[PDB]
Design a protein around this ligand. Structure first.
Ligand SMILES: Nc1ncnc2c1ncn2[C@@H]1O[C@H](COP(=O)(O)OS(=O)(=O)O)[C@@H](OP(=O)(O)O)[C@H]1O
Ligand SMILES: Nc1ncnc2c1ncn2[C@@H]1O[C@H](COP(=O)(O)OS(=O)(=O)O)[C@@H](OP(=O)(O)O)[C@H]1O
Ligand SMILES: Nc1ncnc2c1ncn2[C@@H]1O[C@H](COP(=O)(O)OS(=O)(=O)O)[C@@H](OP(=O)(O)O)[C@H]1O
Ligand SMILES: Nc1ncnc2c1ncn2[C@@H]1O[C@H](COP(=O)(O)OS(=O)(=O)O)[C@@H](OP(=O)(O)O)[C@H]1O
Ligand SMILES: Nc1ncnc2c1ncn2[C@@H]1O[C@H](COP(=O)(O)OS(=O)(=O)O)[C@@H](OP(=O)(O)O)[C@H]1O
Ligand SMILES: Nc1ncnc2c1ncn2[C@@H]1O[C@H](COP(=O)(O)OS(=O)(=O)O)[C@@H](OP(=O)(O)O)[C@H]1O
Lengths: 150, 150, 150, 150, 150, 150
């Protein structure tokens, strides 16, 4: 349904490099509605929890540290197939393998500093959202440009 | 030869969402010459005739209505391999499956409202052109940036 | 009223330099609705008539010749104070005195090749329109983004 | 000092027309740091309090309603002379009289729907900020591109 | 004559902030031809000589130091009235006072780090050019888009 | 290592069509540092040597001729995996087969005039670089945005 949602978060490197508006604009132009938005610096707790499935991976160490080394613009978009489209638009893990046109492909270079995070599945979406956003912070209703869907 | 032409038409949603300029600019930046251009509201007759090959398809119903529910910017471009290139740049039918950088992949979200139409073969081009444009409305001669071809 | 109209025409140099979409996009982004659009090569008659008020000026010679030396994308936009806003966005006669942000300021250099024409007054608007467009070629109705006006 | 801050808020039409990203990007490109950001629907109380100085003005009626008829992206930027600069970049009250390059001059058309609001004085900034943002939602420290200041 | 030239130089902050391409593109779009281009780190000797006219000015110390603290992309453009046009495009000394649309107005914030330098007069152009480019490094001939001048 | 380098060169058509700034900006946005830059007209000697590997290929004649028919903007970028990243960004030989988003895919149409050249391997990079730049013209040190690498 045209009410699917995903969790996106411009990480400390996207924020510091001034890529917040560019990244948001790409999604707005696509047709997805912003449903929640806010800036905060993640806590170790939030980072670990957010990155739970990578608990015993060599990189989990650095993920947690960096994602809490500064402000993060957390956000929630909504729209048909937003979870698949978002990831698609984001690119692939390694910015260097990301095709031009995608976020990481156009702006990224080191997997350590790959600008943004997008939920991988509606399952991780629903969890990630409920982790970063008090339900109060999300639009109870949404009306997309009528020229978007049939 | 560097004289092939394709028919393109920003559909009611492209036009209504204000994507006429961006769409044209993308092909102008590519190296193709506008040989014709015009805005109008297609008639049931033209829509049906335009969508002939999909007469007995479940969606044809909605195709003809929508493409006539408002203004359409019909246009004809020219240049080497313009037909294959236009489609590539337009993306795939479902905007969600269209790669970033393509028209439908950057601004589309529903198959029902997918912004633009490009001729799929030189065969359909020749026909589609002849349908929307009286031959008088088309450049009898063209001169592209000399820096474009060899 | 939000129904005022103006006549714009990307001249042979804007067209040849590939500035059609860029110029159209600027107006679309502003909030004005396209009401008519078409491409044609002006005839000596049309040029002279169009440039009537400059009949005995040293430059009238060249204006007429050049504006008929190639295709011209004639168009008609609509919206509140479109005639004043259009000119504003176009810039001033001499591209070099045109501030950055305007069309001529960003793209122009020689007054001889100043990319575009915009009607100077609603009076010249109403005349110019009726000169370049058979009434049939203009939308009988218009519905702008409801987010545009109050 | 390089710590001055101003309050900005993309109004319902900016948000609805999908201009959140572009607006933010313009200030990010300028050199200012986002110290706070969030989206919400203002309450009659906040709108009235926000528009206090215009209590007995004919338009105040519509100001409070509209700014509460939908989501608003409130945000706080920081940097040298940010208040005077923001306003300059925003343009003048009437979007039609706003020069190209400014926000209102590039995308606005009606005084009623003029996209964004910027604090007019450091005095109103300090107040406006304190109204929409709990001090917890604001960066306690900021570090701008070292290439920005001397 | 359409062969006047000016010396432009992206200072260390423009270079470090990644504004080289944007700045060149702005002039390329305008109509001016690149006649010389190169990246180098100014030597104290060159900075001093280049800033000769401000020898005993308070800021002279920092101008020389900063402009040699890193790579500068020196360039020479050519075109009718380029010197007055480049300056207009660059904006005014204080980036805060630069109108949106201008280089300094779109990206600068401190007078000390104001991105780029443009010759002030044809007098200074001829001089400045002769100072940073060996005559061999400048095009002996130039052919601008024929759609540019009359 | 984040110090790998590649040789890029905007060919005469990219230079003449005014794509220099756009092409540099694309790489600047990606994360790569400009380490050398300059504009020159290739001599037959250099074109031949540069195209050595295609000595007895049918197209070799035109490659050498065309690349010396005008100014070429030679440049050397630096960054982790730049050689494979630059190539990806450039697209594939036939601009018609280049995906949208890539340089050749966004602006090129003929294999003969395909805008830019990027080294194919670090082997060719080291060689090509050594051929168009005297070691003195390349930065002896580089400091990329700290928000780029881990
Ligand atoms: N090698 C390495 N070094 C550092 N950080 C890394 C590395 N591999 C993965 N990551 C980041 O951790 C998340 C891994 O998600 P993936 O599903 O892409 O894992 S994998 O790398 O593809 O195996 C994912 O973070 P988010 O995308 O922010 O969720 C990766 O970007
Ligand atoms: N679901 C749905 N709804 C509406 N129209 C649809 C649908 N699926 C296919 N089509 C349209 O048929 C056009 C050609 O389709 P194919 O090339 O995919 O077959 C193509 O439109 P144009 O490209 O505008 O001709 C498709 O949009
Ligand atoms: N010196 C000179 N040489 C060539 N062409 C010229 C010259 N002066 C004006 N024009 C063009 O003619 C129209 C004149 O309109 P203006 O009202 O601007 O006249 S004036 O030049 O300001 O006196 C106007 O054309 P449009 O803008 O296409 O209507 C000018 O661009
Ligand atoms: N006609 C009309 N309709 C609605 N609102 C209006 C009108 N005229 C003034 N105002 C709003 O008052 C805000 C401050 O106005 P001034 O600085 O122009 O006094 C300013 O809005 P904000 O900038 O959003 O606060 C003006 O839009
Ligand atoms: N206080 C201060 N600090 C640093 N640099 C300054 C200062 N005031 C003037 N300038 C710069 O010196 C150049 C000439 O200034 P004027 O245009 O005022 O003369 C010009 O530098 P360029 O940017 O190279 O033109 C000015 O912007
Ligand atoms: N027919 C024809 N005409 C002109 N030039 C051609 C032709 N086919 C290949 N090339 C160009 O030669 C370079 C190497 O080609 P390959 O990638 O195919 O090896 C590469 O040039 P660069 O663009 O300098 O890399 C090719 O794009």
């Amino acid at each position: 349904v045209n009410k699917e949602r995903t969790f996106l978060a411009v990480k400390p490197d996207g924020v510091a490099r001034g890529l917040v508006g560019e990244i948001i604009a790409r999604y707005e132009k696509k047709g997805f509605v912003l449903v929640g938005l806010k800036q905060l610096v993640p806590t170790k707790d939030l980072a670990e929890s957010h990155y739970a499935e990578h608990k015993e991976r060599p990189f989990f160490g650095g993920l947690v540290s960096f994602i809490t080394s500064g402000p993060v613009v957390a956000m929630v978009f909504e729209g048909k197939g937003v979870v698949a489209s978002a990831r698609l638009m984001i690119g692939v893990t390694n910015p260097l393998a990301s095709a031009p046109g995608s976020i990481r492909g156009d702006f990224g270079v080191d997997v350590g500093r790959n600008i943004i995070h997008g939920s991988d599945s509606v399952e991780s979406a629903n969890r990630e959202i409920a982790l970063w956003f008090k339900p109060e912070e999300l639009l109870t209703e949404v009306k997309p440009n009528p020229n978007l869907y049939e």
